[PDB]
Amino acid sequence: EQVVVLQAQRTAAAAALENAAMQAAELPVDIERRLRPIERNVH
Amino acid sequence: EQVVVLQAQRTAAAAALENAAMQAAELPVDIERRLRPIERNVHEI
Amino acid sequence: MNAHLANEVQYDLGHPSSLVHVIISSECLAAAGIPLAALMRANFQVEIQTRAHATGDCTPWCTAFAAYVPADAVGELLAPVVPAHPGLLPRASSAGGLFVSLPVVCDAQGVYDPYAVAALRLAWGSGASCARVILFSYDELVPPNTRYAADSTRIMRVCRHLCRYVALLGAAAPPAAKEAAAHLSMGLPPISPEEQLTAPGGDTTAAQDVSIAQENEEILALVQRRSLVEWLDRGWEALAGGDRPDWLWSRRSISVVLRHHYGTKQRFVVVSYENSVAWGGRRARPPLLSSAL
Amino acid sequence: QRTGRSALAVLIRACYRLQQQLQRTRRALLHHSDAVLTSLHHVRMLL
Amino acid sequence: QRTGRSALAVLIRACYRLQQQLQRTRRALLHHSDAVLTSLHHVRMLL
Numbered sequence: 001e002q003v004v005v006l007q008a009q010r011t012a013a014a015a016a017l018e019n020a021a022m023q024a025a026e027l028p029v030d031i032e033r034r035l036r037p038i039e040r041n042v043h
Numbered sequence: 044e045q046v047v048v049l050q051a052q053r054t055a056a057a058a059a060l061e062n063a064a065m066q067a068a069e070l071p072v073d074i075e076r077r078l079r080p081i082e083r084n085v086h087e088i
Numbered sequence: 089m090n091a092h093l094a095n096e097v098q099y100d101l102g103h104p105s106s107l108v109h110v111i112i113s114s115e116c117l118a119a120a121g122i123p124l125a126a127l128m129r130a131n132f133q134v135e136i137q138t139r140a141h142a143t144g145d146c147t148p149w150c151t152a153f154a155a156y157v158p159a160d161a162v163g164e165l166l167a168p169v170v171p172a173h174p175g176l177l178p179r180a181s182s183a184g185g186l187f188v189s190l191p192v193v194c195d196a197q198g199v200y201d202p203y204a205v206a207a208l209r210l211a212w213g214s215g216a217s218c219a220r221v222i223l224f225s226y227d228e229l230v231p232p233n234t235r236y237a238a239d240s241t242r243i244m245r246v247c248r249h250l251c252r253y254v255a256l257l258g259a260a261a262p263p264a265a266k267e268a269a270a271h272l273s274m275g276l277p278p279i280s281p282e283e284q285l286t287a288p289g290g291d292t293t294a295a296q297d298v299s300i301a302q303e304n305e306e307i308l309a310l311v312q313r314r315s316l317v318e319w320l321d322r323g324w325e326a327l328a329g330g331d332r333p334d335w336l337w338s339r340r341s342i343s344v345v346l347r348h349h350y351g352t353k354q355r356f357v358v359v360s361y362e363n364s365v366a367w368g369g370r371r372a373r374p375p376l377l378s379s380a381l
Numbered sequence: 382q383r384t385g386r387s388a389l390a391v392l393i394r395a396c397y398r399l400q401q402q403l404q405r406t407r408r409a410l411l412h413h414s415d416a417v418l419t420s421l422h423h424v425r426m427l428l
Numbered sequence: 429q430r431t432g433r434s435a436l437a438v439l440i441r442a443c444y445r446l447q448q449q450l451q452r453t454r455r456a457l458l459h460h461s462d463a464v465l466t467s468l469h470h471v472r473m474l475l
Contacts, residue, residue, distance in 0.1 A: 002046055003045045003046060003049070006046065006049045006050070006053070007049065008351070009053075009427060009428060010049065010052065010053070010056075010428065010475070011350070011351065011352070011353055012350040012351075012427045013056075013424045013425075013427035013428045014353050014472075014475050015348035015349060015350045015353050016348075016350070016420075016423065016424045016427055017424060017468065017471060017472055017475075018348050018472075019347065019348055019420070020417070020420040020421060020424060020468070021465075021468050021469075021472075022288075022346070023416075023417065023420055024067075024417050024420070024464060024465065024468060025288055025465070026288055026293065027414070027417070027461045027464060027465075028458055028461050028462065028465070029288055030293075030410065030413060031410075031453075031454075031457045031458070031461065032454075033297070033300060034300065034406050034409075034410070035450050035453055035454055037300065037301075037304040038304075038399070038402060038403075038450060039447065039450045039451075040308070041304065041307060041308060041311075041399070042443060042446045042447055042450070043447055052474075053428055055474065056428055056471070056474055056475070057425060057428060059467075059470060059471045059474055060421065060424065060425045060428075060471065061425075062467060062470075063421060063464070063467040063468060063470075063471060064418070064421055064422065064425075066463055066464060066467050067414075067417060067418055067421065067464050067467070068418060070414055070417075070460070070461075070464075071411055071414060071415065073456075073457070073460065074407060074410055074411055074414070075407070075411075077452075077453055077456065077457075078403055078406065078407055078453075081403060081446075081449055081450075081453075082400065082403050082404070082407075084442070084445075084446065084449065085396065085399050085400050085403070085446075086400060087442065088396045088439070088442055296409070303398075303402065304402075307394070307395055307398055307399070310391060310394055310395055311391075311395070313391070350427075417464075
């Protein structure tokens with residue numbers, strides 16, 4: 001019984017990484033459009 | 044025996060998440076480390 | 089498309105809860121354990137029930153509707169095909185799966201319970217041996233935000249492909265489509281459904297792109313100091329010759345959100361329209377879905 | 382009188398609002414980044 | 429002569445360095461954030 005649980009939990013969070021990988025792919029995006037309209041503002 | 048193999052992978056995957064957790068838990072330190080002197084510089088003007 | 093139309097009629101007439109329109113991929117069905125050729129042999133009855141969290145009690149089986157397309161699944165939303173003029177909307181290829189709307193059990197001040205399961209059952213024959221059960225947690229069904237902002241570049245392409253096709257058709261055009269091709273040209277690459285699935289931008293990330301814009305245009309000003317949607321409708325009613333309520337929603341805003349399945353690691357697509365009573369639609373009924381738990 | 386007092390008001394409206402623009406980037410980049418740490422701790426809960 | 433030419437040098441040293449402070453926050457927040465995407469791709473390699 002435990003293998004059927006332990007396998008299904010490992011395949012579960014494998015999907016939750018790719019939901020988070022597309023979620024955490026905006027951190028190099030979210031920094032860029034907040035600084036650049038302030039740099040040209042100073043420049 | 045399949046339990047022992049997969050529990051070896053459950054505890055191995057938990058280490059890489061905590062590598063990932065402590066890597067990204069340092070990010071809220073940095074926003075309150077990098078922007079706070081820059082706020083002080085604009086206040087000088 | 090028809091499988092999402094024929095489900096909201098069941099939800100409009102009350103059969104409080106919510107509804108999430110889901111596109112399963114072909115490879116999510118393959119790893120779930122069903123044969124893909126059995127579904128190919130256009131609506132299709134599928135029984136769906138919802139199960140609770142650590143209680144055991146569940147909703148009884150209700151019959152809902154489905155349609156499997158061996159085609160591009162997502163491209164059938166974005167670029168439909170006239171049977172008369174096949175080269176109207178050029179698109180890229182993709183995988184093809186069924187369309188099933190899924191019910192979501194709410195509360196008053198609607199907050200869905202995660203770790204409870206909404207369940208499918210695909211039956212392609214007689215007997216229990218020809219049936220499988222695919223499970224969906226409420227963690228699985230509902231993403232945080234829609235991506236209607238990724239749709240803004242698509243309708244502006246369909247405006248071009250009508251202007252390209254009628255000019256390609258020449259003097260053999262219907263005279264209604266001759267007019268609408270000129271007016272859309274004054275109002276101004278195939279439709280790739282994989283680009284909207286991988287575009288890094290939601291709605292709330294796009295709503296923040298207005299407040300970062302308007303407040304920065306002000307200070308940089310201080311340093312110095314018959315709509316086009318209507319004309320699209322007369323193109324399809326001239327080139328094809330009918331309304332086709334499949335094709336009504338393809339001309340409007342469609343948010344195409346990519347998700348992943350917890351059981352078999354494969355992808356599936358959560359779809360919300362503009363004229364849709366179900367979740368994500370701009371004509372929705374309160375209370376809405378909230379991830380408070 | 383009105384030449385020098387109003388030309389500095391150009392640089393008044395610029396400086397007190399750049400103090401405000403960086404305050405939202407302190408808040409909106411912490412109320413967004415904590416959702417990433419919310420997501421990653423949720424994945425360990427699945428395991 | 430020295431009154432107006434040196435009072436503007438206060439605002440000279442302020443503006444050319446605020447151009448520089450935001451350049452490090454472009455670099456130091458990309459050489460830090462790519463380690464997050466480095467970590468997340470490593471976790472999939474374990475699976």
